[PDB]
Amino acid sequence: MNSVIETILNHRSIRKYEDKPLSEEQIQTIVESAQAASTSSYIQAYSIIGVKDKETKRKLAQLAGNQPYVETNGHFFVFCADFHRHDVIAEMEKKDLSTALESTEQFMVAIIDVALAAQNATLAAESMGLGACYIGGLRNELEEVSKLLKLPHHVIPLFGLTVGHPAGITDKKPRLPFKHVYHEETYEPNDEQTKKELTAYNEEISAYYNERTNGKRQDTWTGQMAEMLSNPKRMYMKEFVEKQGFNK
Amino acid sequence: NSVIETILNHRSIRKYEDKPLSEEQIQTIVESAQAASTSSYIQAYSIIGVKDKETKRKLAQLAGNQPYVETNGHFFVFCADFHRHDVIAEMEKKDLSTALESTEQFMVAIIDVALAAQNATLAAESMGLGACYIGGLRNELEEVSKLLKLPHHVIPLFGLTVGHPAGITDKKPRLPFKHVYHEETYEPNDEQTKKELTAYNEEISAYYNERTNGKRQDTWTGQMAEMLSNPKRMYMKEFVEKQGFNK
Numbered sequence A: 001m002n003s004v005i006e007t008i009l010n011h012r013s014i015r016k017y018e019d020k021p022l023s024e025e026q027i028q029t030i031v032e033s034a035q036a037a038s039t040s041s042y043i044q045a046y047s048i049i050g051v052k053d054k055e056t057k058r059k060l061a062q063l064a065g066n067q068p069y070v071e072t073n074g075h076f077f078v079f080c081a082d083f084h085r086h087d088v089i090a091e092m093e094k095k096d097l098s099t100a101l102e103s104t105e106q107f108m109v110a111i112i113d114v115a116l117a118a119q120n121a122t123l124a125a126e127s128m129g130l131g132a133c134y135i136g137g138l139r140n141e142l143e144e145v146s147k148l149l150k151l152p153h154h155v156i157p158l159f160g161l162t163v164g165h166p167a168g169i170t171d172k173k174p175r176l177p178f179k180h181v182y183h184e185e186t187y188e189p190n191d192e193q194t195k196k197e198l199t200a201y202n203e204e205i206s207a208y209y210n211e212r213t214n215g216k217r218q219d220t221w222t223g224q225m226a227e228m229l230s231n232p233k234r235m236y237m238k239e240f241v242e243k244q245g246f247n248k
Numbered sequence B: 001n002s003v004i005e006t007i008l009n010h011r012s013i014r015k016y017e018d019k020p021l022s023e024e025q026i027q028t029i030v031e032s033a034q035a036a037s038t039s040s041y042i043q044a045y046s047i048i049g050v051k052d053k054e055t056k057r058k059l060a061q062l063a064g065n066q067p068y069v070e071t072n073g074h075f076f077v078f079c080a081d082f083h084r085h086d087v088i089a090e091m092e093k094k095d096l097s098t099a100l101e102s103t104e105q106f107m108v109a110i111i112d113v114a115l116a117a118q119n120a121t122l123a124a125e126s127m128g129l130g131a132c133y134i135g136g137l138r139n140e141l142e143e144v145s146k147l148l149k150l151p152h153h154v155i156p157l158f159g160l161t162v163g164h165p166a167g168i169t170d171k172k173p174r175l176p177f178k179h180v181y182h183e184e185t186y187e188p189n190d191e192q193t194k195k196e197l198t199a200y201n202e203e204i205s206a207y208y209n210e211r212t213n214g215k216r217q218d219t220w221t222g223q224m225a226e227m228l229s230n231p232k233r234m235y236m237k238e239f240v241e242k243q244g245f246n247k
């Protein structure tokens, strides 16, 4: 494969960094790379908050569920869905844009917009020899996160992005089989076939954990999924998102 | 570097050769998509490859008559997928419905699909292919879902056309770095936001003026207000719920 494909395939989430800041040029390059992503209808429905203040990074680490790589890294970015910019447009153009901005369709548009930009930011950071990790943990405390970043109405944090010089190495995490995720023409019609593919993946995941922990853990992927999904959390999300002006 | 150069070279391609990709190129794009980070190892997506010419024609019509959905190297349909997790619920004998039907998990699934799609786009572009996301599929989700025979808990979010370009197009200017990127806190003054949008409007107006030889000089705020004052796909909340999401 070419340079781009080799970098994409080399990815693993890095959770241990040097306490050494990135240069302004590295930060700008990451952001400009994020912006170059496709955007539905040229909407650019995102904002990125860079956090360098040590006191704020420490509070964000605690809010994310005590993730120390949010406090100790090269830079911390907060990726936000942003329709506040479009509320400003509504005033400039003297047109009511609320029906569209508050709709489920636009909420999906904003989430996609942010995520495409974030993945470009991740790849740009990784191509510069930096480690990266998405921080969905911020969603445990979106109200407190929003207050710390002084977000106005119609701006929601979706996740953080830690970047920096790695202070260690980790292995690649095996993904579901290509032929399981990718379907030709139509979705897999037989659930017994899906179970069969998940059973084979479980054997791979169990062996992967067994080898990496020297037998301490042998969790199957379906076992791990059922464990987390049977304990629903962030149930305040529907109400928080609506209060912010989205998915109403 | 080459990853950054490729990222920055992006432009949506809407004119392709009617020449199919190899199976190896299709697999490479999908394996690149899968290598994206995934919330809690969830992998809450499925990708449907469409090669049937009759189906590509119907999809092009459902997308709002976008002929690059019919004529390309390959057409992918990116789906949010919790049906795989419903299968896990039966295998593990655990009720996962509260989490799977929540707004939080709906956000998780959308993010997961989009990160995978952006890796698929970059992999395709690095191979000299043109690419274009097709959100147009969202005009007709029930018909799209029926054509792809999607079960419960699977929703198409957008298509992805790829192929050998049959033409060239320019790069679309983005909002200024200093406008999108904020240090520590969000921009506290809306008068500052208006000022920056006025300057961006001058850039966008000049960009359209130069590319159309004066035929169009649309501002970005003008273009945004025009589309956003005419709400469409208002059936979306109910359709996504009917399929088990965001309840």
Ligand SMILES: Cc1cc2nc3c(=O)[nH]c(=O)nc-3n(C[C@H](O)[C@H](O)[C@H](O)COP(=O)(O)O)c2cc1C
Pocket: A037, A038, A039, A040, A041, A042, A112, A113, A116, B010, B011, B012, B013, B014, B063, B066, B132, B133, B134, B135, B136, B137, B158, B171, B172
């Ligand atoms: C999720 C998504 C859906 C899109 N849907 C369409 C579509 O249906 N048809 C199309 O021609 N372009 C579509 N696009 C491409 C955008 O119009 C394009 O990214 C934007 O105009 C900026 O242009 P650029 O990608 O050339 O920089 C979509 C982009 C995204 C991110």
Ligand SMILES: Cc1cc2nc3c(=O)[nH]c(=O)nc-3n(C[C@H](O)[C@H](O)[C@H](O)COP(=O)(O)O)c2cc1C
Pocket: A011, A012, A013, A014, A015, A064, A067, A133, A134, A135, A136, A137, A138, A159, A172, A173, B036, B037, B038, B039, B040, B041, B111, B112, B115
């Ligand atoms: C949107 C999103 C949010 C995530 N949130 C967290 C988080 O809060 N903390 C963490 O350590 N990892 C988080 N991750 C990383 C995933 O756990 C990781 O991508 C997954 O376990 C697969 O491992 P890999 O990225 O090393 O291949 C997140 C990933 C995504 C895509």
